[PDB]
Symmetry: D2
Subunit: 122 residues, 4 copies
Amino acid sequence: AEAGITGTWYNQLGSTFIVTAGADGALTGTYESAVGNAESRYVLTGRYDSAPATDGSGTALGWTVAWKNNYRNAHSATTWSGQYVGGAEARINTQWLLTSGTTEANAWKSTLVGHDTFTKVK
Amino acid sequence: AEAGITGTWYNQLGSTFIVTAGADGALTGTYESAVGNAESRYVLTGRYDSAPATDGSGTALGWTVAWKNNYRNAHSATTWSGQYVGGAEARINTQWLLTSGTTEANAWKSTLVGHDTFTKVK
Amino acid sequence: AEAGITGTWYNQLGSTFIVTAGADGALTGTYESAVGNAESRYVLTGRYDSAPATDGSGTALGWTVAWKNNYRNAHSATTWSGQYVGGAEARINTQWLLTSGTTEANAWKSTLVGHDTFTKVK
Amino acid sequence: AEAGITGTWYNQLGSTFIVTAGADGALTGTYESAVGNAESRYVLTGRYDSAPATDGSGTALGWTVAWKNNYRNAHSATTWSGQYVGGAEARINTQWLLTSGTTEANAWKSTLVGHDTFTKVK
Ligand SMILES: O=C(O)CCCC[C@@H]1SC[C@@H]2NC(=O)N[C@@H]21
Ligand SMILES: O=C(O)CCCC[C@@H]1SC[C@@H]2NC(=O)N[C@@H]21
Ligand SMILES: O=C(O)CCCC[C@@H]1SC[C@@H]2NC(=O)N[C@@H]21
Ligand SMILES: O=C(O)CCCC[C@@H]1SC[C@@H]2NC(=O)N[C@@H]21
């Protein structure tokens, strides 16, 4: 939790996420996607369990990114739900949901699901 | 977007979520789950597309809740990814991922997936 | 389980699914999607818990459809995982994953996730 | 497609899946989970795109397993949706939904979501 989450992480797609975990569960930072209709950095906000468990369990967290910045607007948002595992080789394992804004008719195909693993090394 | 999202919403489980959408894509508020290991209100933070599309598409958004407050700590976090549809009958349709902090061994079963529909009326 | 699953079901999109549940957990039938790149009927196969629980719980089941038939080939497959609830108003509540065949590069966006509710009445 | 899918695959959890892909899109075989409330082999059935795309894309497929056999009954079912990539290092990348049969009240927590990568070598 806290101390260990803050920093720069990289996932297998080459995206970068920089976060600051605050004392009381908040997560703030920027995300730069290596793929998709995105350019540069986007703002992210989230929450994490600041009082994780005796035991060697992971810390649960989640964050969101709306794919709109000053360069592009993809009219979509991604939320990543996962857990942080610290240690020699700390990682954040997640599953994500990417929803695009659609018309009611195309709503059945509005969401992509995937998973990303983030490490401190890339 | 913006104006229309702010307020109190209720989903089919009887949970309540109160949010304020800010001018530049931020979402802030509290969530009270009617089910699960939760008691009272939890803080939520998220993001939404403040510049949605000509067209009648939904606005994409997402938010997170870490299930830790002053009463309980479930060591879990939920992220909801969906879109807001305004109108006579405005709703927010979402899919969610609820991750619990586990030991590496039980990580395969760390995440629940579901969907919630929120309305302004309950 | 068994007896009760067999028949024609309809979901909220207007798709039709006809299945036969066999004595030992098998599910067979055809699916006709009302949306997407599909035309006519596609073959489906799956499995269900033939020995469900004392109790009023649902029966777990799942099935798959590859979107290739004699009219079209969408190079995709959908799997529905859910449970059957019998009674006056029997329904099958599910969550589905629709994966399209992509090049390694676009694999992160290969899967859509959604949910469908099927009833015996449409 | 076809020829290349048939065989024994192993995923990162140590589970084994043996399948036979039939000429016209069917998948049949057995699954042995290394984790969970399962013992020995379970029957699986599924479908795959027998006429995949010029191009180097993956073949879409999906299969289901109901966790009931002669030794145990977990009253649950898993469906895996993913794609097969052949080559020197062929793999099947998937995302899965595991639904347990619950009472209507606990249905919101009836489904786990995860991802598995299968290889021909373990
Ligand atoms: O195309 C879009 O809608 C905007 C970019 C989405 C990029 C996604 S979010 C999940 C996956 N992980 C990443 O780092 N990037 C892609
Ligand atoms: O049990 C827990 O881990 C904490 C409560 C989780 C409640 C979930 S989040 C999704 C679903 N929608 C709700 O409003 N509540 C449940
Ligand atoms: O476009 C395709 O790839 C083929 C059709 C997919 C239709 C999907 S599967 C889930 C949802 N429920 C339906 O009945 N149809 C759509
Ligand atoms: O506990 C159960 O309900 C039965 C076993 C479920 C095992 C799951 S399915 C997905 C994941 N991949 C595996 O090979 N095993 C676990």
